[PDB]
Amino acid sequence: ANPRQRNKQRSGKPRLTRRNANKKAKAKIYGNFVIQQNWDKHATLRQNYARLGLLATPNYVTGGVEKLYPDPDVLDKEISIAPAKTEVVRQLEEEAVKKAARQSNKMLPLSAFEHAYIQRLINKYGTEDFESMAKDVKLNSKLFNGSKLKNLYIRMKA
Amino acid sequence: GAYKYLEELAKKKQSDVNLFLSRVRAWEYRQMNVIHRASRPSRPDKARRLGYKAKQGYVIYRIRVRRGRSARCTAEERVGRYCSNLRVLNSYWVNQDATYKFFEVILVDPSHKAIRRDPRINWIVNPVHKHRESRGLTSIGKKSRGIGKGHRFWLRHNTLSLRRYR
Amino acid sequence: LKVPPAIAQFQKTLDKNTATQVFKLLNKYRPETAAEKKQRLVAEAEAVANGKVSKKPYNVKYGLNHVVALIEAKKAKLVLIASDVDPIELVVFLPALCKKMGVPYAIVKNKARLGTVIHQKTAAVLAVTEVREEDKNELASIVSAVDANFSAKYDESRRKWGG
Amino acid sequence: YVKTWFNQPGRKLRRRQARQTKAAKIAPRPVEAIRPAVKPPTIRYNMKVRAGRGFTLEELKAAGVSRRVASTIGIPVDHRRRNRSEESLQRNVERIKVYLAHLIVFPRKAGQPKKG
Amino acid sequence: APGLVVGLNKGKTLTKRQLPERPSRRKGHLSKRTAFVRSIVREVAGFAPYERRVMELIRNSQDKRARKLAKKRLGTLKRAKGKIEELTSVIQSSRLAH
Amino acid sequence: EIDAGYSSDSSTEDPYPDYDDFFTNTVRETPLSSAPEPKRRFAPSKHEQKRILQLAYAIRKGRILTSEQRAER
Amino acid sequence: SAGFVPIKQKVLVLSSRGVTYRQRHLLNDLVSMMPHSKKDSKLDSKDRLYQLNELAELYNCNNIFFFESRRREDLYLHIARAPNGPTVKFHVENLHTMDELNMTGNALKGSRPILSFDKTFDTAPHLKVVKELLQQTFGIPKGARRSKPFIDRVCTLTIADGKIWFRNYEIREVTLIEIGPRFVMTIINILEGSFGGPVIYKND
Amino acid sequence: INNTVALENIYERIKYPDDISFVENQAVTTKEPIIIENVEDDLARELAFYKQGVSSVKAAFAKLREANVLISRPHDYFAEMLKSDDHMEKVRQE
RNA sequence: UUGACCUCAAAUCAGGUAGGACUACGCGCUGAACAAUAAGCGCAGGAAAAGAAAAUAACCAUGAUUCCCUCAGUAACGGUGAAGCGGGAAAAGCUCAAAUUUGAAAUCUGGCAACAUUUCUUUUGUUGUCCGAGUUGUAAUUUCAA
RNA sequence: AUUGGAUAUGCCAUAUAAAGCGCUUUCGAAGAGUCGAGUUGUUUGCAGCUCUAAAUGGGUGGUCAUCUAA
RNA sequence: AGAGCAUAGCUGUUGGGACCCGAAAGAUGGUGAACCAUCUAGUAGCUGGUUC
């Protein structure tokens, strides 16, 4: 119809074709390797989350969920977790424990500067009157507060 | 510190200080060209609060428009067309008299690496903002076309949406 | 033409003799140029790197917002205002605020002179707050000199419609 | 000016396909964020209960979640909604608490400089 | 099981909680600093030509016309009342100082 | 009781005063900054203490010539 | 002093925010047939009505009008007396704008009108009060500015179904012709003060 | 509450000079209380209003004619009408 | 005087960028017939616009925008003709101006030098130094939810 | 072959630093020829002209509720 | 001691270009009084035709 469409239909140049149409094929899973391995490539995400023990939506389903077979005083209280209903959820949960196990050393050491910084304060103002040792300014060059001085005292221990 | 004091000195535009300045400034501006560069803003606090920062790539142009479409909205279309490469940020009233309105229009250089590398003014380098003074996407453009939230602020009527099963 | 008294002040600037005496004192407390500040810092960086208490800096305070807030705190001992600021709107309130807070002040000639004090092209206002004890008695002289050549002198001329 | 709904089965499948790529990108987390329970603001539906936009700041603090992290573990925030009735605070705090019961949180590696 | 259960109701029992203050509602409070800033600029910028004539009417004690002039210039009485109270505050302060 | 009296100005029938310093006539005896003074203005500057650290970084890794290296160079 | 050349009756025309096209037309009509009506600027305040007393002193209008526009369709009318006086609420509907074709009369501008009142006004105490108040309001005082000594208007007020039918009737050389002011007028409540105080009468 | 005593006192206090002549006071009374039983019927309502208005106008006009200035407006007086000239022309056309 | 600072210019001074084309969708200005209608003009993108309440509501109150369904041919107007509500799709929040870093312009473009880097010898960076920009205010900080 | 977001792990980290929650006998800035009024055009807003503001204020709804513009 | 609601059909009616064809247009914008292009499916009680 159009001039631009029609001149290249008559010409001899090949058409810039793209065999892109793959209907009915879903998006292959990347990201978490565990779920990818247990991801059925044919089932829909609502079916696969359910088969894997995961909630696709914590919010109300707005429709009619499939029936494949004929199926027969508290603000202080805390919900004591939810046991995993599938092995695959336990696989995800087990990795969470191991990843936290590696990242367990959250205590930091001290560098040389703050090391001798805390010794100079400690050997002069004891070890208990942290407010008084924050009140001094001759040695408290940076003018730290009592709260941060105690943190350095704890961190220097280990 | 100062732009607090400059805020309330600009709130009184007929007081003697301002009126004496309105005559002095308008006389010398009319002596110039219609659209001319301005080194420092004639209102530093207003330019500041409208987005202008004293750094390279931020530009200001002063324009007078005959009184008698919005005048300020005009100042933006005329300045932008004059400086074809700069993107117009904003615009503000600086002065007026019996026969003219003097407007300053802030522009940004989309190519200057002080701007392109600025995380906050980067949004103006994107081509969707080409000549926002021309589409009505500036402040006065947003006002002059009645865009906003409120009850005081077409084809959805004429259409006949016939669903598939009707 | 007739001029409001708010702008008429800036015509009656500080005298030639006193302005030089202000700048002679100020020149002792110029801010460190960015060059030697890099050299001064690198001396401490080298001291930290190989292995290792200072004192408060003493300079003049500059910047329109910086100086206004020093006055509003009454931390300014002396304010110096350039008589030829481009939009005069910037300092037309400064003599009012400087009188309201009891801060002695003087309108000095040219802004480039003040800029040279602070290693800048142009300085719209300078303020002296802290002065070393050596020159404490010296500063009180100019404050009296400003109070004698700017507050005692003029005063009434500050209120007349200029031009 | 007339509109036709021939793309109605086309648009629905495009939406389903758009949900599946989202699930692919974010595997463990649900495709939908949690929403609170609120009541419609009219005498006609006021006895009803539906979903809200997000959990107000009293709903987060009472449940025990800071407002900054809540945006990261998928709990959305509504600075505009407020709690006037305690039953509205109660129905949405327990809604958060049941969510944090089933919420596995993956640890993230953290920079640990040699000094401190 | 995280699940929203909509419909019917959830509860008829009501307990109103005394709502806090939102800081956006705080807008329009007179900051102690900015009152000084506004006052000092009012002194510096002087007074409007129409507003200067209001002062003379108050000094001449034709307050009835002063209200009429301000109302005509500004637009409503409360805008005119505040200006008159703003103007008369100037007049009394100048007369006690000078 | 208004007596229905009509004003004579009804529509139905010095240019340069001196500077009046009514506000700055007296000196304020206190500042305006009600906020407490912070720690910055009494402790060594943290701006240079940050710049110093990354200068030690560049000195240790040889990014920048040292002061003694500068003299001999 | 209190005033120069005092005339007893004056009208203070004023409408709150939200006046529409029709309500604007009748404000023009009211300012037309009433010579000494003091048209004023709208109120930013939709219920701060007691501020009218300060305005009443300003313009020295013994009678005060208020054209309230509730929800852009409810046309309210408020009428009172400047010194305290009975602040009576009203609701007016089904108006006749001057552009309407129903008008074919021709009456002079500022002519003293003939006040005709139904006997039903005197039957009730409150209705008699509003009849006297309307007599003071509509009745153009002698010596009114921008007026004429002739008589070419007759106002007829008939009470039925609890509301008043108002009609403006022009005397012809009677073979009267309606000038055009015509509506339904209903009373709501009466206040013992000027836009304030307790309510003395409440219409049901 | 419809306080008749308060209303009567207010009406008596706010009573106008009814002792003046009807033409002088510019006030009249309906001949038959403007009795229009057919409120819905425009013709019946207009006729009842016309009868009450005409009798009041005639009595006032006769009193004014006998007392100095006649109420009737002669065509000699070129005073502007309540409606504008174009409005009067539009009223005549409509 | 010197020389600063301000303005004024020029240069084949380096580094740039604008124009015209397309126009289904999109944002503006403007417009008569027969209606924000055609047209005319102006400006864009893969979407455009809009957008985190100077928004509703009178409730047990809701909660950025956009689209769909209903509300509804309803209210209102005088045939024209909606909006909350509700139900769906989708969801994400934010940055400035107004604070003295003042115990230290801490910020940044450009020249030059090496180091790198690549859809790429065609890209995009860093380090060092020098010069400018900037104190008439560039960073950090804080945005009312605080 | 070209890339994308994750994982695993090596090296480097300028951390004397930077955050969240908490407690406050100390504080809390808020966008003007704008809002608003009269008036005139356009199609309620918008535009010109005439004036032109405030600081628990200002806009909008019903003495209250909500919101926080330029 | 409720009889509707929904779908499909038929005939009828009201709009929509409205059974088909035919009245000078007018307006916008262009080209060199003329001419061109679109808005336009502008307008009809009328004319001619309307199929086994």
From Swiss-Prot, chain A:
Record-level GO BP terms: assembly of large subunit precursor of preribosome; ribosomal large subunit biogenesis; rRNA processing
Any GO CC annotation of this UniProt entry: preribosome
Subcellular location field: Nucleus, Nucleolus
Region described as Disordered: 1-23
Family matches, as Pfam families: Nop16
Principal subcellular localization: nucleus
Superkingdom in the source lineage: Eukaryota
Keywords: Nucleus, Ribonucleoprotein, Ribosome biogenesis, rRNA processing
Primary role: Involved in the biogenesis of the 60S ribosomal subunit.
Similarity section: Belongs to the NOP16 family.
Classification via PANTHER family: HSPC111 PROTEIN-RELATED, NUCLEOLAR PROTEIN 16
UniProt subunit comment: Component of the pre-66S ribosomal particle.
Protein's recorded name: Nucleolar protein 16
Originating gene: nop16
Curated annotation (Swiss-Prot), chain C:
Family stated for the protein in its record: Belongs to the eukaryotic ribosomal protein eL8 family.
Assembly and binders: Component of the large ribosomal subunit (LSU). Mature yeast ribosomes consist of a small (40S) and a large (60S) subunit. The 40S small subunit contains 1 molecule of ribosomal RNA (18S rRNA) and at least 33 different proteins. The large 60S subunit contains 3 rRNA molecules (25S, 5.8S and 5S rRNA) and at least 46 different proteins.
Subcellular location: Cytoplasm
Summary of the function given for this chain in its UniProt record: Component of the ribosome, a large ribonucleoprotein complex responsible for the synthesis of proteins in the cell. The small ribosomal subunit (SSU) binds messenger RNAs (mRNAs) and translates the encoded message by selecting cognate aminoacyl-transfer RNA (tRNA) molecules. The large subunit (LSU) contains the ribosomal catalytic site termed the peptidyl transferase center (PTC), which catalyzes the formation of peptide bonds, thereby polymerizing the amino acids delivered by tRNAs into a polypeptide chain.
GO molecular function: RNA binding; structural constituent of ribosome
Keyword Coiled coil: no
Gene: rpl8
The entry's keywords: Cytoplasm, Phosphoprotein, Ribonucleoprotein, Ribosomal protein
Gene Ontology annotations for the cellular component aspect, listed alphabetically: cytosolic large ribosomal subunit; preribosome
Record flagged with keyword Transmembrane: no
Lineage: Eukaryota, Fungi, Dikarya, Ascomycota, Taphrinomycotina
Source organism, top-level taxon: Eukaryota
GO biological process assignments: cytoplasmic translation; maturation of LSU-rRNA
Main location: cytoplasm
Protein name stated in the entry: Large ribosomal subunit protein eL8
UniProtKB/Swiss-Prot annotation, chain E:
Origin superkingdom: Eukaryota
Molecular-function GO term, any one: structural constituent of ribosome
The organism of origin for this protein: Schizosaccharomyces pombe (strain 972 / ATCC 24843)
PANTHER family for the chain: 60S RIBOSOMAL PROTEIN L36
Compartment(s) where it occurs, according to its Swiss-Prot or TrEMBL record: Cytoplasm
Keywords per UniProt: Cytoplasm, Ribonucleoprotein, Ribosomal protein
General function of this protein: Component of the ribosome, a large ribonucleoprotein complex responsible for the synthesis of proteins in the cell. The small ribosomal subunit (SSU) binds messenger RNAs (mRNAs) and translates the encoded message by selecting cognate aminoacyl-transfer RNA (tRNA) molecules. The large subunit (LSU) contains the ribosomal catalytic site termed the peptidyl transferase center (PTC), which catalyzes the formation of peptide bonds, thereby polymerizing the amino acids delivered by tRNAs into a polypeptide chain.
Keyword Signal: no
GO biological process: cytoplasmic translation
Family per record: Belongs to the eukaryotic ribosomal protein eL36 family.
Positions of the UniProt region annotated as Disordered: 1-31
Protein name: Large ribosomal subunit protein eL36B
Quaternary structure (record): Component of the large ribosomal subunit (LSU). Mature yeast ribosomes consist of a small (40S) and a large (60S) subunit. The 40S small subunit contains 1 molecule of ribosomal RNA (18S rRNA) and at least 33 different proteins. The large 60S subunit contains 3 rRNA molecules (25S, 5.8S and 5S rRNA) and at least 46 different proteins.
Short name of any one Pfam family annotated for the protein: Ribosomal_L36e
GO cellular component terms attached to this protein's record: cytosol; cytosolic large ribosomal subunit; preribosome
UniProtKB/Swiss-Prot annotation, chain F:
Similarity section: Belongs to the WD repeat BOP1/ERB1 family.
Cell compartments where the protein resides: Nucleus, Nucleolus; Nucleus, Nucleoplasm
Entry protein name: Ribosome biogenesis protein erb1
Annotated signal peptide: none
Top-level taxon of the source organism: Eukaryota
Quaternary structure note: Component of the NOP7 complex, composed of erb1, ppp1/nop7 and ytm1/SPAC890.04c. The complex is held together by erb1, which interacts with ppp1/nop7 via its N-terminal domain and with ytm1/SPAC890.04c via a high-affinity interaction between the seven-bladed beta-propeller domains of the 2 proteins. The NOP7 complex associates with the 66S pre-ribosome.
Complete-protein stretch covered: 101 to 256 of 740
Role of this protein: Component of the NOP7 complex, which is required for maturation of the 25S and 5.8S ribosomal RNAs and formation of the 60S ribosome.
